[PDB]
């Protein structure tokens, strides 16, 4: 019943809020992470060695896979601004 227009600008509509939600999730995220780093480092000093060790090894993980939900959502917008038609 509706026309293919009708459907594709549909399909636009939830293309544009799915893109930015996934979005402001990625940033809530980086946000936490970057405030807890603050509050470990504080001390960091005064852990014992081996716990030390840890940090570094446990800390390079979570950045790298916070980072990888950064780079999907980059990707993601540039794909759907093309399908647009738009190349600026």
């Known amino acids: 019943s509706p026309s293919v227009?009708?459907?594709?600008?549909?399909?636009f509509g939830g293309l544009s809020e799915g893109?930015?939600?996934?979005?402001?999730?990625?940033?809530?995220?980086?946000?936490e992470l970057t405030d807890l780093e603050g509050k470990l480092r504080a001390k960091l000093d005064r852990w014992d060695g081996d716990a030390q060790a840890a940090y570094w090894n446990y800390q390079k993980e979570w950045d790298a896979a916070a980072k990888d939900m950064q780079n999907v959502v980059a990707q993601l917008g540039?794909?759907?601004?093309?399908?647009?038609d738009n190349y600026q």
Do not use: C, P
């Open 5 to 11: 227009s009708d459907y594709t600008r549909a399909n």
């Open 19 to 31: 893109e930015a939600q996934f979005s402001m999730t990625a940033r809530a995220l980086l946000d």
């Open 78 to 84: 540039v794909a759907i601004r093309e399908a647009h």
